[model samples]
Target: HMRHRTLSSSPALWASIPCPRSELRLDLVLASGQSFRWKEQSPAHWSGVLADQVWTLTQTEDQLYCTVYRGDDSQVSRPTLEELETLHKYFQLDVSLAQLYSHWASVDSHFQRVAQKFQGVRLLRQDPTECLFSFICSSNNNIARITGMVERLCQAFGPRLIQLDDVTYHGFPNLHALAGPEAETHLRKLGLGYRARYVRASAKAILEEQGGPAWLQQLRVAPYEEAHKALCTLPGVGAKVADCICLMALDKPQAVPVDVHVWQIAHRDYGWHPKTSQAKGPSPLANKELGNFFRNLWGPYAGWAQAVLFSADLRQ
Candidate 1:
């Protein structure tokens, strides 16, 4: 693989990567810390999605890279790799990260095993609004297909921007634009199938719903349970999807999305029979049991705790 590097507009606070996700790229998903979209500070630059945040990766040569945490939006500080690692303490902050990891391990040894295997996929984060929309399209769809569909959303309905190489790329369309008739009509033709409806539904909710993007800040101030409940109310949202958004985006420290991979791990290795579905998806894990599993076993940071476990096995 070609080596990549990142140097933000500043030092001491800039983040960089030596190697980017060769297989994937960001599509304007806001990271957990940042509510704004991620774009190349300029075009033809290298980048990555890690620690649930995007890094402006620049490629100079092998074994060298950097990242800029535009997450703060207003005063983005690009931390050095070491500094950024400290920021994700959950990923690279080992003593601290390991401490949290052990708590989740108590829930089941399998989680522990997952941590060791891939070091928890680093569970790179993504934009909550985009996650909400993307996961909605995941209904009864395969990961590859769902991923393809998301790209289609960008290609078909997103804004066009000229890349550094003079190539064109699209920024994902905003909620308002996607909710309109023209874009929906276009997205439906992209083989999104049922997900097209889900996408549009979410767009409408975020743009027109009484408390969409505007009120999310309020939820951020609310108690975890309350914020999660409010998130679940978004059109087509369910327990797991809402939890995923909460954990990765809202920082609901204990939220775990419980997708099929986690459920499989739960049933196959841990002997935890999910007693019920969240009325959102097919997983049978009971709410009380699931909550207890994380809190009692994983501690206060269960959401963060599970990221490593979930990421190790589920990423495509």
Candidate 2:
């Protein structure tokens, strides 16, 4: 039998498992602005939903443990090993963040300075639909505001997953739930602001094109260009949003989602400026130029590099 303990007030198992917290820093990754579902209780304690299960996880010297909260509502109990495995899959913990850093640092001096200083930051292999919708809400937004918007989206449209400490948590809404009658109206009321129309339209477009979550998952094998083009068809999905989905969900590591912060990083830190008179403007051509520059500079894992650089830039 495996070793486990019960949490002080919940019916769950705190299974002590071996995980190198140095490589998979939960705090860094969750707060990296990719996924908004996780909440940090303390320095190293976090709880979030992956798939349908709500997990409370913490790390120590020799233990990376999880207390899997059972059931879809208020009920709670021990979690099966199969349930625990979703954490590994969702986090993509098998990929070595340490090695990724070493490879990037060896090529670029800028990366070498910031990579170690901002250690433990890495990309999240988030759910494709969730990633798409999250980034759609992310345009012209900050992390704090985006997090609130996502939470509201779930509460308004998605099903309730669990209730913890008297607060009910909901899942990210499915396409039907989002594309239904009055979705845009209701979403706007829910404080999505002008993005309400985009959310509704994008959901409907996916359904019409037979491009649900599973279809997006299948795009993982197709060329990155193919995936990028397909994603752009969705409403509110500009080149930046499409790239975010490709890099974070479609497994396109070379995809870099250029925003104002990332564009500034490229120009200021990397000294990459456009030759055109409209270079100062946020034109599509200017974005493409800088995007291509970084993609070629950081090589295959350019998207991951952007995550590190963008996070650092945002902090400054």
Candidate 3:
């Protein structure tokens, strides 16, 4: 256990950014299963690790307030300019959620039906390495279990940053840390099950076979097809997980991740049928075909539209 201290005694000050609830609903986005790190400290207040610092965020009708705890002895009062920029980029504030909702609603009737109830639900732009490993744990897992496993993985392998309200926050472990010899054993003991091996193997591949962090970073700038294909070659990444990494971390908005929920949405609402098989039953469509169908239906930001619909489905 590394030496860690509580932030209760620190002079953490609140900072503000010009954002509206329509653009970002902290409640929905944080708990929408995109990233597993954020926790609601209080009503409308979320604390999470972003860019290696712990941040607590809350929003009003026209403003987003944040408090950053760096866990150092420096008397930093508010978030720096760079940190504010990180917040903006993390939430993807540049992309107009209002315009997206309007656009999606105009095309899809189902989207129009659920758009109002599920406002402010958007894809988070997360760190590619953290996003990759997190989604690797998401295979055959629920959101709650995935969140627990990610937390445990961080505590076991990542560096301790700060303690808040008796809970110590740790950074997401880098590729090298996860690729260590005993990573698999430690992760298994932490109740990661089969995912332990996948996590370790994927980390090793990223570190040695791939060009470390640069490889994943480059995928962010690559075209959607190229990025998705490159990610699928990773040890634990499949079409669905690769799409998730592409949409959330890499800059691929067309990369729709077709999970069971989305599949049901496709069948029940969108009338999507498996083209390859003529089975008159609720058979599974190939992930690539289903994803492409939705991409065609929703256009460029199909992944973002899928997220909104997915959130609406989960609420029901």
Candidate 4:
């Protein structure tokens, strides 16, 4: 049986944490293509699922405000200190974006110009399963389409959590839910198109062949290249998708996903061209080579830097 609750009856209090605009921009990072779940319900307010709870977030110049709905679990009357820590870890608040910006600005003039407007662009520490499956749906897709597809996937397969503004929210589904034989058919019917088969197959492969969620979690601690290779073994996950998973999920700061947009950015802005010649007009460089060029140029958190530039490009 699914449980439902209203905020009017059981009010969730807003909790504030010390977060500066320079450190994290709630609007930019959430809306940026890093993760697809967040929805800007109102102007500066965003609502989404994080760690299986519905979180509504907003921010002042120096403080980030949050409230969560955990669905009938009355263990805590208020958002707990533990929940605050979860927010801290989820945002990776320990890593100073201000400092990173300064460092990048000092080294790269392009990033300096880009960073001036695109502050607080950092990677979200998303779950590996969510990250892997989400990006698999990202092939040849735009943000709006991918967001719709992911919302449908969650609504169809994930557990029903709560209703807000008369809209239902669900937690991301587990492997068992996604790996069933009927999953592909249902997902295809829901308009996942080609991604349906890949999502289902990858879930099954991870559950039965790759030792379940533990294997994916272990990749968090694994070396970047090893984790990237391991993720690439999954169905529909290629070099770019694997790098996306690595950077956003598996703690690989240097893993850059060289999509066509990033490829153009490399060629036009960074003066990068493939060593070997190919066909006409902005020919695609090998993904690894292009990714490596940016990695070397941007240093350890190259993926994060790439994300900043990517967000800027999207706006332009």
Best by TM-score: 3
**What is the C-alpha lDDT profile of model 2 across 1-316, one tens digit per residue?**
2112234544344675677766666766787688888887544667777776677877765466788765534444566677667777666777787888888888889988987767667777888888889889998898888988998898888877767665567878899889987999998888889899999988988887765767787788888989998888788999999999899888998998888888777777878777663647668888887788887787888898888887777666
Error of 4 at 100 (Å): 1.1
Candidate 1 lDDT at 86 equals: 44
Q: Candidate 4 lDDT, tens digit per residue, 144-186? A: 9999999999999999887777668888999999999899999
Q: What is the TM-score of each predicted model, taking all chains together?
A: 0.67, 0.91, 0.94, 0.93
Could you give candidate 1's per-residue lDDT for residues 1-316 as a string of tens digits? Answer: 1122334434464444433332112221222221223334455453433333445544433222455443433364555556555434422323344445565666667776666654323333444566677767766766567656766687677654323233234555667778887666777899887667767877787677745566665665678788778877776677776776777556577776676666666666666664545354343346546655656667767776665555444543
Q: Any idea what lDDT model 1 has?
A: 0.55
Displacement of the residue 236 alpha carbon in candidate 2, Å:
0.4
lDDT of 1 at 28: 15
Instruction: Name the TM-score of candidate 3.
Output: 0.94
lDDT of 4: 0.86
CA lDDT of every candidate:
0.55, 0.79, 0.85, 0.86
RMSD of 1: 7.7
Query: Per-residue CA lDDT of candidate 3, range 1-316, in tens?
Result: 3222223333256768998888888888897789999888666778889978988888889988887877876565678899999999998899999998888788788899888787889889999989999999999998899999999999999999888777889999989999999999999999999999999999999889987999987888889899988888888888889989999999898889888888888888978777886764444346677887887878899999988987788776
Off by over 4 Å in 1: 1-64, 67-96, 103-108, 123-125, 164-168, 274-288
Selected candidate, larger lDDT, 1 vs 3: 3
